[PDB]
Amino acid sequence: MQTDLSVWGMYQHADIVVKCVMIGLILASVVTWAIFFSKSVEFFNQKRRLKREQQLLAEARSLNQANDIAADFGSKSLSLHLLNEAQNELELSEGSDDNEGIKERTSFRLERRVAAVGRQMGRGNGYLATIGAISPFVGLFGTVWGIMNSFIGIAQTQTTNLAVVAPGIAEALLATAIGLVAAIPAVVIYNVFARQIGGFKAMLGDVAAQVLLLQSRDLDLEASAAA
Amino acid sequence: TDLSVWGMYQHADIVVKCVMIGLILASVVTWAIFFSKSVEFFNQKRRLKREQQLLAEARSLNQANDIAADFGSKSLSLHLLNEAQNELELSEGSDDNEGIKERTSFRLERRVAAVGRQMGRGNGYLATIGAISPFVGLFGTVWGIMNSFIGIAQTQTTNLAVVAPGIAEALLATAIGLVAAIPAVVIYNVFARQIGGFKAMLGDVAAQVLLLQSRDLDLEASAAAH
Amino acid sequence: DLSVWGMYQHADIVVKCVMIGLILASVVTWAIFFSKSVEFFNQKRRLKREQQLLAEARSLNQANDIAADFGSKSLSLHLLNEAQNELELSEGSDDNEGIKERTSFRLERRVAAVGRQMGRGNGYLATIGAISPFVGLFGTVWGIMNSFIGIAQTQTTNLAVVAPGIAEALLATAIGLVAAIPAVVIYNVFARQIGGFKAMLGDVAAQVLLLQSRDLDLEASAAAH
Amino acid sequence: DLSVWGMYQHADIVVKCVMIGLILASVVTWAIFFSKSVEFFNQKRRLKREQQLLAEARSLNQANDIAADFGSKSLSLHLLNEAQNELELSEGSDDNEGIKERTSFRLERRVAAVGRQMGRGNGYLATIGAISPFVGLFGTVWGIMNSFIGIAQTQTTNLAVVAPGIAEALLATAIGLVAAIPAVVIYNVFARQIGGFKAMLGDVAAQVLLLQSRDLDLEASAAA
């Protein structure tokens, strides 16, 4: 053990229970970075699109103006998708005179879509929260096993020289180090995506609110014009 | 050299001294807040309980005003009844009873939340002392550990008994950390529960005001229609 | 050395006082469990019977005729009386939406009040379960500190000379764990059972609101002809 | 002569009971996982497939005709029956918004009740996750304490005398964490999968409310 050592040599002499722990944590960190690169690109594209759609709708003063402006948006556009969800509630209510019925149904539909889009936008976040919470204790288990193996060394050799306790503290350090290297990124990335989801659901809620305000005002003006 | 808790504090480094004094002062604040808030919560709980029990017979909002008129100026239930009667006197011309009911419901819910906010004053110190005083102690431990290993290096000593005083400083800085932290966390959880219970009891009083007002408006309207 | 009484008698007051405090926390968590579990079980068992009888009812008058045989402390009879009393206090009204919203609001408040009253012991349990480990840690940090003072004063030591000091610290930890484990188990058992009870009471209250609301609409319809 | 089995063989009777207790807690947390994982997969797969069929409907009549074959324990059929039953209890009512309120309230009760009933067994996962560290730690504290109580009588000055007992003690923390980590992961997994299932069932219940609401308003206009 204690001659010409390196950090990789420290992993090479580890017990098979502590190799599996730190290999498992390495894979859990690789999936953490794969989620970060995948989701951060998606949040950038979705938020950059939605900000543009909201700014292009800001001059709309009727649901017909919003519908025509939004006809230029791509078929994947959440803003067009909310406008079609509101337009469809009119085209499925055509024979009714109860505008309060139309308003409450449209409010309920758009609220359900905004919740569903937020719920889909959060897809990977539960994995990140799990690694950030659990990987410290998975690392700790490997430290306890290394510390235990250090006492197995003392008991098996009947002495307390550094050379017989060293294999156990060596693998306890690695289990601590890899435990932290998995935990810290997962906590950071989870806080970033929790902030990005809050900002995005709020911005999508402001677009959905503009659609409801446009529809509600347009129905009340049409009803007064009929009167 | 003295190894009493006092002799140990007297031998400690300036960084560890001001950590111990900072934690001790945080514990003085944690108890000063506890005795200040508890006497106020006991008096406000006892007062509001009596007022609710005494409003229970009220058949109408007029009876509730005549009952509450004897309550002293700081009375929360009198203050809620004034908020409800003031929404009537601000809107006499209105004929939309539903609006009055909605405007009054909105005012009283806002007032109950404001009393909750006002009663939660000073809890930020208890949360902060509970969260940081462990870490502040930890730091006092690690600084004591560093000074002892710097002492080993500077002196070139090899008997581990020379660091036993130094690690007793670090353990004391840990202990005073828990002595500041644990009461602060317990007391924060206690006041968070007492405020929730108080907001609920004040909400039950505010609900009786809305029920009295709503029923009086409906009964006045049917009598005027007949 | 020899026994738990040996550690208790030969322990620093700070550590002794920590052990008495944790033993009293253990006593109070068992006192709460035995005191609350029997009355909670009787509320749970009774409320389930009342709901099974009331599930037959198809008008609010039929629900009063079912409930009138219930004991004067029955939560279901309280909710039926609380709803019936809104009709008593509103007899001159020609507005039904007012009666519905006042009843809905009054039952919501009544259900929440029983929810607070049923959960009343939980503050001790949640606190003792979360905090007893840290009180144990203060006890061991203090006992371990005194053992470093022993090393620093004597300056000639072996693991048998300190063995009493670490046995006292470990005993203070063991008492900390013996306070903490029951408190978390008992707290989770009540957190589940109270959730199920508040839900069941909420579904009885929902049946009373549904029956009253439906009965007012059918009466208001019959009054048109 | 130590190994992970030999340590369990040569342990105190209290550390054995802690280790056996934690292994039984491990058997339980994995039995709950395999039981609930299959149940949630089947119910998720069924409910998503039923929602895909009901998305075609344009009246509550057409919806409950589409659902008529669904199994007698189908959740969407159970919600459609609960809406249809508020109509058949209300046949004398000229008030439509009262029916819309009563059905909205009653379906909210049932969507919550299904999510609550689906959460059965999670109290074991939460409890096993919370206490397994403390039960393993009690095994360690006790094992260490029983070893030093011994040396305090023997007066032996050598660490190699206690070291077997110390290793046998630390092993009860290791088993404590092996019982704990799966239970706390799995508790969070099911708490999240119940949230997503309750949300999807809410999206199905919303379609029933929208169809009933639409039909009552169209019928009122057609009568007028």
């Binding site: 659990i134 307390t160 | 581990l160 | 840690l137 000091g165 900390g176 | 560290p133 730690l137 660490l159 706390v184």
Partner: peptide, 28 residues
């Protein structure tokens, strides 16, 4: 809702102080 479900390993701090003593005192 309201169950305690989090891991709490805090008594292992106490255990580590005890191993810190037995290694301090068992120096060769």
């Amino acid at each position: 809702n309201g169950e305690m479900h989090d891991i709490n390993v805090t008594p292992f701090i106490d255990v580590m102080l005890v191993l810190l003593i037995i290694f301090m005192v068992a120096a060769p």
